[PDB]
């Protein structure tokens, strides 16, 4: 049929998608700025489509409910036909690959530890062997699933603690995790992706840091409904942008070029 | 060969695929050891196929001739139907993705610089600004194509030099590039992927070093002929092995430091 506007599901997650300063008098795609906003424009240019950025309604990345088997978040939007493509920091995982298509990765990451500066913690092993400093992850994402599924002793130990910690150590958004680290006087550490960790490390008041090596190694991919015709072109577009150095340029632009914690 | 036996094309490249000690009295798959030999075993178990490891006939990764437009190397073997799958440190690139299928990446890497210890070079920029120290890359691989295509000033400058350098600065195998660094008294530097650079840096005679950051960021993938029925299962197997931590285990195993260099 005739060309239709492509519905892009994404998520309000800095610096991937953020509200522009004058958003209150702006409409459509103009309300937003960020790494994934720039990336969406580049993909659309290369693939020759018009698009509408839509923030995922439940504000989640995507998990499948164990009982109802229903997918939420951006994955749900794709699975249930509410969106045509997801352009966001969406982790390529086994369970998601079974239900949606992913491009080759546009960005690499690993789960990492965020602490308030001066917290006596250097590693996951350190966290697991003490009880004074609480720690948790984002809900409905690939990091929580990592711990839940791990058969590695240290990560299994951390999961056993986290899953039953009171009050809850899990947060609904990254911003909530960041606030908890910053306000807890060193008594909360946050488990999140190195990409987000490194970004926050560059934001005022410069009181957090990434500590230790990454716990794993993986990638974000652009997602489409399983068997979507858009998938092949989008995948080539990612590889082309990668090889032109444009992904490197976008990362530097949004993470470091206007970092607030110095040069 | 036997029916239902998958023909695996691969390449002799340490520590991905190497000849075992006493291999001349060994037979079939038992002749070889290495990261990709182990990976092939795990992939085949997860997908339920028997397989035959074969070393690519021309010893090349794969490039398309500009005039004939014939593909050589492991890419050629998939393209012309001589192999069913490639399991090797084969870089996922735009031009290859157009002609073969790739799994999501099983290993990350970037182009990097290898010098003989003490060589006064700290970066690609340094290399481009001088003429005393020659430098080159592997023939018929993604590193050579990277420089050939780059619009980035420094890399553009390096390509202009390398393409006309005499005697040739290009080598047929990584081993020869390494030997050339070692024997050239600091007058040759070698551009190669960070994975191989780091392996060599830990091996005797401990006389080479990686300098500077990686020049790019990419991934190795398992490749199959376009539209091969093996593709989907192999891709899910890579993601499963990734999430179980088995790829990390294999990396630690074959990049294991016995302390040939220092403590
Ligand atoms: O997906 C990746 C990966 C690999 C290379 C990348 N290069 C650029 C951007 N993103 C990348 C992601 N992984 C790392 C190695 C083990 C499997 C996960
Ligand atoms: N990128 C993750 C969200 C962040 C996290 O889980 O830490 C996902 O796709 O689920
Ligand atoms: N990994 C490369 C070979 C090594 C190199 O080009 O430096 C390829 O797949 O072509
Ligand atoms: Cl429309
Ligand atoms: Cl298993
Ligand atoms: Cl010329």
From Swiss-Prot, chains A, B:
The record marks 64, 148, 240 as: Interaction with the cone snail toxin Con-ikot-ikot. Induction: Down-regulated in the pyramidal cell layer of CA1 in the hippocampus by global ischemia. Disulfide bonds join 206-261. Palmitoylated. Depalmitoylated upon L-glutamate stimulation. The modification Phosphoserine is found at residues 150, 184. It is found in: Cell membrane; Postsynaptic cell membrane; Postsynaptic density membrane. It comes from the Eukaryota. Homotetramer or heterotetramer of pore-forming glutamate receptor subunits. Tetramers may be formed by the dimerization of dimers. May interact with MPP4. Forms a ternary complex with GRIP1 and CSPG4. Interacts with ATAD1 in an ATP-dependent manner. ATAD1-catalyzed ATP hydrolysis disrupts binding to ATAD1 and to GRIP1 and leads to AMPAR complex disassembly. Interacts with GRIP2. Interacts with GRIP1. Interacts with NSF via its C-terminus. Interacts with CACNG2, PICK1 and GRIP2. Interacts with GRIA1 and SYNDIG1. Part of a complex containing GRIA2, NSF and NAPA and/or NAPB. Belongs to the glutamate-gated ion channel (TC 1.A.10.1) family. GRIA2 subfamily. Ionotropic glutamate receptor that functions as a ligand-gated cation channel, gated by L-glutamate and glutamatergic agonists such as alpha-amino-3-hydroxy-5-methyl-4-isoxazolepropionic acid (AMPA), quisqualic acid, and kainic acid. L-glutamate acts as an excitatory neurotransmitter at many synapses in the central nervous system and plays an important role in fast excitatory synaptic transmission. This is Glutamate receptor 2. It comes from Rattus norvegicus. The chain holds residues 413 to 796 of 883 of the full protein.
């Amino acid at each position: 049929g005739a060309n239709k506007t492509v519905v892009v599901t994404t998520i309000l997650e800095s610096p991937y998608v953020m509200m522009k300063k004058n958003h209150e008098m702006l409409e459509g795609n103009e309300r937003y700025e960020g790494y994934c906003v720039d990336l969406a424009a580049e993909i659309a240019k290369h693939c020759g489509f018009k698009y509408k950025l839509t923030i995922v309604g439940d504000g989640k990345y995507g998990a499948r409910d164990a009982d109802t088997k229903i997918w939420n978040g951006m994955v749900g939007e794709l699975v249930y036909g509410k969106a045509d493509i997801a352009i966001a920091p969406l982790t390529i995982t086994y369970v998601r690959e079974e239900v949606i298509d992913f491009s080759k990765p546009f960005m690499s990451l690993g789960i990492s530890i965020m602490i308030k500066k001066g917290t006596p913690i250097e590693s996951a092993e350190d966290l697991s062997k003490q009880t004074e400093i609480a720690y948790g992850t984002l809900d409905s994402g690939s990091t929580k699933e990592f711990f839940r599924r791990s058969k590695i002793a240290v990560f299994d130990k951390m999961w056993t603690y986290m899953r039953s910690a009171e009050p809850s150590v899990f947060v609904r958004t990254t911003a909530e995790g960041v606030a908890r680290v910053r306000k807890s006087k060193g008594k909360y550490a946050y488990l999140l992706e190195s990409t987000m960790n490194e970004y926050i490390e560059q934001r005022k008041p410069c009181d957090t840091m990434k500590v230790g090596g990454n716990l794993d190694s993986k990638g974000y991919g652009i997602a489409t409904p399983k068997g979507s015709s858009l998938g092949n072109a989008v995948n080539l577009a990612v590889l082309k942008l990668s090889e032109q150095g444009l992904l490197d340029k976008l990362k530097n632009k949004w993470w470091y070029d206007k970092g607030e914690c110095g040069s």
